[PDB]
Amino acid sequence: SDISEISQKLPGEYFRYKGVPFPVGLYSLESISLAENTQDVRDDDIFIITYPKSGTTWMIEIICLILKEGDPSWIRSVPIWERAPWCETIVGAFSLPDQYSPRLMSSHLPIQIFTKAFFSSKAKVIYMGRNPRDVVVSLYHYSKIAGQLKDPGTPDQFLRDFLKGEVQFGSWFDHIKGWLRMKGKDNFLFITYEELQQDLQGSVERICGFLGRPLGKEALGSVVAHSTFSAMKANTMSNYTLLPPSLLDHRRGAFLRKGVCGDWKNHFTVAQSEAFDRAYRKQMRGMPTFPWDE
């Protein structure tokens, strides 16, 4: 009833924190500032960082499974947003009592705003990226049913806003370019939605190594089985169907929409695709090659 009241008051608008757009209602100057300036970063803390709609939910479920060594009990009985709380939200992981030994947290904050005390910590970060074209599409549909987000408008107008960073959490380009500046540190891992799609078991093993949490063939296969799109779409605790209708309109759509790579080709017209490549080419001039670069 506390979250139900809040959800019904969501305006579907934005406000700015240090030049970056944040959805009104689920975030505030205070909540963001807290996550940015807190000193409570621990050596064994684990952070999942992503630009919205890059497959955060996927990574979160994978690690929740890894932590319990393949046992689905925790993901079956505890809602996902409670198993890996968000740093910047009004009710963040930093404004809640210690309820888990190794803390698992999530964030969409770009590097210049993410918890500053992190740079001198031993805490671990897994940054996940996805083809920005599929990100646009996923974000377009999600916005129509997401209470905190304003309506997208036309596919074409929404695409222009995306390219100019006129969306929640700012520019995708700046987001990923900034975070890749951590590449090289041993407490930072960069992985992509595309890699998990290509070889989920392989990706899971890499994440186990990175976290220092090896798994037997059994637990491994379990993490994989329960991390699959179909399995997660059917898990009431992970698929978001428990949220208030005003926060997420279950009646009109689902958080786990399609779960594939390439759905952008069914939404971008050729002209929009060409305009996107021009923007990408100019913004990603010196960047390394990514799986989504064809």
Ligand X SMILES: Nc1ncnc2c1ncn2[C@@H]1O[C@H](COP(=O)(O)O)[C@@H](OP(=O)(O)O)[C@H]1O
Ligand Y SMILES: CC(=O)[C@H]1CC[C@H]2[C@@H]3CC=C4C[C@@H](O)CC[C@]4(C)[C@H]3CC[C@]12C
Sorted by sequence, the CB contacts under 8 Å of residue 244 that are 6+ apart come out as 3, 4, 7, 8, 147
* Residue given tokens 């970060």 in the structure block: 125
CB burial of residue 233 (10 Å; 0-12, 13-18, 19+): middle
Using the rule CB under 5 A, is 146 a contact of Na ion? Answer: yes
| Residue of the chain from 22, 58, 81, 264 that contacts ligand Y (CB under 6 A) | 81
Tokens of 48: 């999942």
CB of 151 to ligand X, least distance (A): 17
Q: Which of 116, 99, 115, 97 is nearest to 107 (CA)?
A: 115
Stretch of 24-32, 48-56, 139-147, 236-244 lying at the interface with Na ion (CB under 5 A): 139-147
Asked if 58 interacts with ligand X (CB under 6 A), we say yes
Residues designated catalytic: 108
Interaction with ligand Y in 120-179: which residues (CB under 6 A)? 148
Q: Tell me which stretch binds ligand Y (CB under 6 A): 58-66, 69-77, 82-90, 129-137.
A: 82-90
Q: Which is nearer to ligand Y, 239 or 283 (CB)?
A: 239
- 189 DSSP β-pair partners: 126
Please give the Cα distance from 176 to 277 (Å, whole number).
17
Q: Which of 86, 118, 127, 162 binds ligand Y (CB under 6 A)?
A: 86
Q: Between residues 146 and 243, which has the closer beta carbon with respect to Na ion?
A: 146
Stretch that binds ligand Y, among 86-94, 184-192, 193-201, 212-220 (CB under 6 A): 86-94
Determine what percent of the chain falls in helix, strand and coil, rounding each to the nearest 5: 45, 10, 45
Question: Closest separation between CB of residue 150 and ligand Y, Å?
Answer: 14
CA dihedral over 188, 30, 144, 237, signed as positive or negative:
positive
Q: Are 261 and 193 in contact (CB under 8 A)?
A: yes
| Contacts to ligand X from residues 135-194, by CB under 6 A | 138
Residues that bind Na ion (CB under 5 A): 146, 149
Residues that bind ligand X (CB under 6 A): 50, 52-58, 134, 138, 227-229, 232, 256-259, 263
Residues that bind ligand Y (CB under 6 A): 3, 26, 52, 56, 81, 86, 89-91, 148, 243
